[PDB]
Amino acid sequence: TVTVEELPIDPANVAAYAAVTGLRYGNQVPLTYPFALTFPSVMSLVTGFDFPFAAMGAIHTENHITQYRPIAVTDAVGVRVRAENLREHRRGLLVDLVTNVSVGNDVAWHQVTTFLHQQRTSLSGEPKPPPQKPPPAAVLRITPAKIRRYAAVGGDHNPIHTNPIAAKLFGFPTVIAHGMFTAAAVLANIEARFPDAVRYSVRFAKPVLLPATAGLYVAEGDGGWDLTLRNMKGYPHLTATVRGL
């Protein structure tokens, strides 16, 4: 467990984040923003010192955010993080990083982030699953330079997103986008209609090799939104759901 009593929010950092992700800057932080805000506290738990990087080569596989109420740019926040549920995967060791962000003594925003830390495991002899696979609602175009900018703003400088040598050392043929860049970028416009209490579940699949041109599909429903971002192969970079609580 790591604990941070009172963490102020810099409105400039929110603005800069909203600008880079293409999201709206206003009185409420964007739904995904407390990922960036808390991340250096998250990695101080694994490292013991403040460290603003996911472990080099780590792969973000899943993220579940439950927002009970919006967090104001003017709020200061209580932060508590914990690590749990180590388990083996074919391509490494998954761990869950569970974050509680409070305003007053109430929990406004909760997150389960699962990172895959690459390494051989006893499941590594075992075959590659297959995937689970028209004109899109929008097209995301993502450059190395947008992702160098995202690194500065979103609390994670893991150099597999910015330096090709680092990427290559960890199995990637070019630099790749951060998972949470893309998780934030897909919310553009759509976010205007979110209720204040909302859950956002993201599953990450094919790495977003840069430069990337990627088609975004959005089905709106009574419950909320189903999102899929893909590369036209046409396999998924992510699939996700937004649901009003």
- Sites of contact with Cl ion (CB under 5 A): 60, 178-179
Rounded to whole angstroms, the maximal C-alpha distance in the chain is 51
Residue closer to Cl ion by CB (options 60, 91) is 60
Cβ atoms 78, 94 nearer than 8 A: no
Shortest distance, CB of residue 113 to Cl ion, whole angstroms?
10
Residue 214 phi/psi, 5-degree rounding, is -135, 135
Residue 109 phi/psi, 5-degree rounding, is -155, 130
Residue closer to Cl ion by CB (options 52, 179) is 179
Residue closer to Cl ion by CB (options 165, 192) is 165
Residue closer to Cl ion by CB (options 156, 191) is 156
Residue linked to tokens 């973000």:
60
Shortest distance, CB of residue 178 to Cl ion, whole angstroms?
4
Residue closer to Cl ion by CB (options 171, 223) is 171
By the 10 Å C-beta count (0-12 exposed, 13-18 middle, 19+ buried), 231 is classed as: middle
Shortest distance, CB of residue 58 to Cl ion, whole angstroms?
7
219 Cβ neighbours under 8 A, 6+ residues apart? 225, 226
Residue nearest to Cl ion as judged by C-beta position: 60
State the CB neighbour count (10 A cutoff) for residue 3: 12
Shortest distance, CB of residue 140 to Cl ion, whole angstroms?
16
Shortest distance, CB of residue 59 to Cl ion, whole angstroms?
6
Residue closer to Cl ion by CB (options 102, 111) is 111
Shortest distance, CB of residue 195 to Cl ion, whole angstroms?
27
Q: Where are the beta strands (DSSP E) in the chain?
A: 2-8, 59-67, 76-89, 92-103, 106-118, 138-142, 198-204, 212-220, 224-230, 236-244
Q: Return the closest-CA partner of residue 146 out of 190, 73, 237, 208.
A: 208
